[PDB]
Design an enzyme around this catalytic site. Structure first.
Site, PDB file in Angstrom:
ATOM      1  N   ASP A   1       0.849  -1.185   0.000  1.00 53.24           N
ATOM      2  CA  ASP A   1       0.000   0.000   0.000  1.00 53.24           C
ATOM      3  C   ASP A   1       0.891   1.243   0.000  1.00 53.24           C
ATOM      4  O   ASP A   1       2.121   1.155   0.124  1.00 53.24           O
ATOM      5  CB  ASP A   1      -0.986   0.027   1.182  1.00 53.24           C
ATOM      6  CG  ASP A   1      -0.295  -0.066   2.538  1.00 53.24           C
ATOM      7  OD1 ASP A   1       0.922   0.213   2.628  1.00 53.24           O
ATOM      8  OD2 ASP A   1      -0.979  -0.423   3.520  1.00 53.24           O
TER       9      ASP A   1
ATOM     10  N   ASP B   1      -7.846  -7.681   0.042  1.00 54.31           N
ATOM     11  CA  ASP B   1      -7.020  -7.775   1.246  1.00 54.31           C
ATOM     12  C   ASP B   1      -7.850  -7.381   2.470  1.00 54.31           C
ATOM     13  O   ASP B   1      -8.778  -6.576   2.371  1.00 54.31           O
ATOM     14  CB  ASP B   1      -5.800  -6.868   1.147  1.00 54.31           C
ATOM     15  CG  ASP B   1      -6.119  -5.425   1.519  1.00 54.31           C
ATOM     16  OD1 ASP B   1      -6.035  -5.083   2.709  1.00 54.31           O
ATOM     17  OD2 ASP B   1      -6.472  -4.636   0.630  1.00 54.31           O
TER      18      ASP B   1
ATOM     19  N   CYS C   1     -12.886 -28.007   6.254  1.00 55.13           N
ATOM     20  CA  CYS C   1     -11.636 -27.317   5.989  1.00 55.13           C
ATOM     21  C   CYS C   1     -10.480 -28.305   5.793  1.00 55.13           C
ATOM     22  O   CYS C   1     -10.368 -29.282   6.520  1.00 55.13           O
ATOM     23  CB  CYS C   1     -11.325 -26.350   7.135  1.00 55.13           C
ATOM     24  SG  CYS C   1      -9.839 -25.423   6.906  1.00 55.13           S
TER      25      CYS C   1
ATOM     26  N   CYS D   1      -7.244 -27.419   6.121  1.00 57.34           N
ATOM     27  CA  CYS D   1      -5.988 -26.870   6.627  1.00 57.34           C
ATOM     28  C   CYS D   1      -5.336 -27.804   7.642  1.00 57.34           C
ATOM     29  O   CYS D   1      -5.985 -28.699   8.185  1.00 57.34           O
ATOM     30  CB  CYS D   1      -6.163 -25.451   7.176  1.00 57.34           C
ATOM     31  SG  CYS D   1      -6.546 -25.400   8.901  1.00 57.34           S
TER      32      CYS D   1
ATOM     33  N   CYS E   1      -7.090 -27.994  11.139  1.00 53.18           N
ATOM     34  CA  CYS E   1      -8.292 -28.828  11.229  1.00 53.18           C
ATOM     35  C   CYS E   1      -8.015 -30.316  11.075  1.00 53.18           C
ATOM     36  O   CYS E   1      -8.876 -31.142  11.394  1.00 53.18           O
ATOM     37  CB  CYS E   1      -9.330 -28.391  10.201  1.00 53.18           C
ATOM     38  SG  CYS E   1      -9.988 -26.756  10.572  1.00 53.18           S
TER      39      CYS E   1
ATOM     40  N   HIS F   1      -5.581 -21.264  10.299  1.00 51.35           N
ATOM     41  CA  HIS F   1      -6.880 -21.742   9.836  1.00 51.35           C
ATOM     42  C   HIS F   1      -7.680 -20.660   9.117  1.00 51.35           C
ATOM     43  O   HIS F   1      -8.267 -20.914   8.068  1.00 51.35           O
ATOM     44  CB  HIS F   1      -7.739 -22.306  10.955  1.00 51.35           C
ATOM     45  CG  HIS F   1      -9.190 -22.357  10.596  1.00 51.35           C
ATOM     46  ND1 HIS F   1      -9.737 -23.384   9.856  1.00 51.35           N
ATOM     47  CD2 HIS F   1     -10.193 -21.470  10.805  1.00 51.35           C
ATOM     48  CE1 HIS F   1     -11.022 -23.144   9.655  1.00 51.35           C
ATOM     49  NE2 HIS F   1     -11.326 -21.992  10.226  1.00 51.35           N
TER      50      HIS F   1
HETATM   51 ZN   LIG Z   1      -8.951 -25.286   9.085  1.00 54.14          ZN
END
Ligand SMILES: [Zn+2]
Ligand SMILES: [Cl-]
Ligand SMILES: [Cl-]
Ligand SMILES: [Zn+2]
Ligand SMILES: [Zn+2]
Ligand SMILES: [Zn+2]
Lengths: 369, 369
Positions: free
Chosen positions: B90, B266, B304, B306, B309, B335
């Site tokens: 930015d 963003d 999820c 990730c 998880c 996460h």
């Molecule tokens: Zn997750």
């Protein structure tokens, strides 16, 4: 693997190297055990990558939150935190004395430093809590002695500690699952007094434990005095079982304890130091916050093999720590713990090769240059 | 790869999916850009593992510490933090307005919210700072408009912003290394007024940029008003260049912006929310601190993918967050950012397959059930 098997592969003077086999894995000794509770800025996989074979869990912290019974319901501590290797748990005794805000032959009642809630801790309850946590190495519950202590106060606390050691032993044996899968360490007391240390050791060996901790040191006596007490204390403990110096410590302290026959260590220094900006190096500790590192492109330490020293500069970590960025604590801690594992590895290697004495000398020359 | 090439692979109504190619890598659009400065609790490798193609760096934060010139000396931002893919920076303008404590046609002078030190920021200096940082996508320096704004104040700020856009353009073009390896985005202003938005867009397209941000939204106008302004605003921007909605935002906001033709996003929500205990799920956000999760053995979200998880329960993260443990912030953030990347992936897939409209409906039904 067996429940517990300590084997000594090599010796040099009083120093020993070898292994403890336990159902959840093998522990290389001499060993450093990172504190898995108490800053807590690493994933278990990361702790394992630094080379740790075992971690320590603080019973006091866990009995308060989320609570021993809740941890069991959730599947135990290994499952909860995602560490599947051995875990050693302290008894909770020390922290109750220092972190908490009434003692008796039965045990100790106290109020939580958090919400002021009430709790009891006795040899039996501490042993039960460690069972509920699922710990692999269980510490007997004892009564701490402040430094300095009079011979009378040291004698009485040590004597109560031996009575509590027997109660810990029996409580642990009466629980089948715990007795068959876990190990129990006794803890030698006696302050700085040789004769008390001898009675404590005789008492512990009479009861019988899988391992023997030397308690009551690293509590403000200084390195000279500590080493002096280890000199006469460790040889009193059974030679064929691991010797665990609780709460030690600085790298130079570890090197000297091993020379005096200690096999196991724990300390908050690497994790705590991490947050405060202290990094361990072979040339002594540095404080990364110091202005002299603001444009230093070298890794924390020039030889360290950790992922932090492969990827990031002092200059960047200097910035992360000074800016209060969480990543800063993550990297300082990973490096510090990794440095400690590299220290233990060089100790084990040097003992195995019969050149530990030379390593200790070279270590100090450089570390204290 | 080229300096900059935006290619659109598929469209559905106003939504587009495709890619931006840049020397440091490819960006899949629509794209979410995790904020790489500002909690900062992830290693770059971890940010990349969640699926991020690009991250955002805050110029204001970096010019204060460790300083633009120091970052260049150290080898630039990519090298300093260990992220080798594209970085969008930015201009510093927004934060100077909100985080800092005198405006002119030349630029803005201000005192650091930290040590009260003085600094100037102009189109030229902001562009130079972003160069010193080594940024791949550079934002033109502009003057923000507060919500709400009068037509007169909005007109004047927008007009100054277009003058500053031209200065940004020229400053960037006069620096050979920057012009040849980086890209420059212009930023449309005009508040909620259609006619001003049109003049801004015409002015930006006249100057010519690699991409066009829609500025001035997500500043307290509400989702209805935001969407209403996007409705007429985005089609004014050149269709063949990326459209970047700055500071947005919540998952439902992102889905609606894409439906209105935005390609880039963003927001601090996923990282900020992380520390405060908010986890995003397909069934809506949850606050892990809530007592109802104390013994919940399920992962943060049931689908999820990730690493958090796969490995840890709500019950454990509930404990980490409530106990102030750094690991708690690390896992909630990993996460949340991963969830955001999975959201963008489902958006890109659905547009590619011509079923984005159906995905948007199904997403909202469940997310807001
Ligand atoms: Zn997750
Ligand atoms: Cl914990
Ligand atoms: Cl940063
Ligand atoms: Zn905890
Ligand atoms: Zn290192
Ligand atoms: Zn920073």
């Amino acid at each position: 693997r067996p429940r517990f098997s300590f084997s000594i592969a090599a010796r040099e003077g009083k120093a020993r190297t070898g292994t403890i086999e336990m159902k959840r894995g093998v522990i290389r000794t001499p060993a450093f055990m990172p504190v898995g509770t108490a800053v807590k800025a690493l994933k278990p996989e990361t702790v394992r990558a630094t080379g740790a074979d075992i971690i320590l869990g603080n019973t006091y912290h866990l009995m308060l939150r989320p609570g021993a019974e809740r941890i069991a319901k959730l599947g135990g501590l290994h499952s909860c935190m995602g560490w599947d290797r051995p875990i050693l748990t302290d008894s909770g005794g020390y922290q109750v004395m220092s972190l908490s805000s009434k003692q008796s032959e039965e045990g100790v009642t106290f109020k939580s430093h958090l919400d002021g809630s009430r709790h009891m801790l006795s040899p039996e309850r501490s042993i039960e809590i460690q069972h509920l946590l699922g710990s692999d190495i269980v510490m007997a519950f004892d009564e701490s002695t402040p430094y300095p202590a009079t011979p009378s106060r040291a004698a009485s606390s040590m004597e109560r500690s031996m009575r509590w050691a027997k109660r810990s032993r029996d409580a642990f044996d009466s629980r089948k699952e715990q007795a068959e899968n876990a190990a129990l360490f006794g803890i030698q007391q006696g302050s700085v007094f040789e004769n008390l240390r001898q009675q404590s050791a005789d008492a512990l060996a009479e009861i019988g434990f899988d391992g023997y901790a030397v308690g009551g040191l690293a509590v403000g006596e200084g390195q000279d005095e500590m080493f002096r007490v280890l000199d006469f204390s460790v040889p009193m403990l059974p030679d064929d079982k691991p010797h665990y110096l609780m709460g030690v410590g600085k790298p130079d302290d570890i090197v000297g304890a091993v020379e005096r026959g200690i096999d196991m260590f724990d300390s908050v220094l690497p994790t705590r130091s991490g947050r405060n900006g202290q990094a361990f190096t072979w040339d002594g500790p540095i404080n990364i916050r110091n202005a002299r590192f603001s444009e230093d492109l070298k890794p924390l330490d020039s030889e360290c093999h950790c992922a932090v020293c492969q990827k990031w500069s002092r200059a960047y970590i200097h910035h992360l720590i000074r800016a209060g960025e969480i990543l800063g604590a993550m990297l300082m801690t990973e490096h510090n713990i990794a440095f400690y594992q590299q220290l233990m590895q060089k100790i084990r290697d040097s003992i195995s090769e019969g050149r530990f004495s030379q390593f200790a000398q070279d270590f100090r020359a450089r570390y204290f240059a």
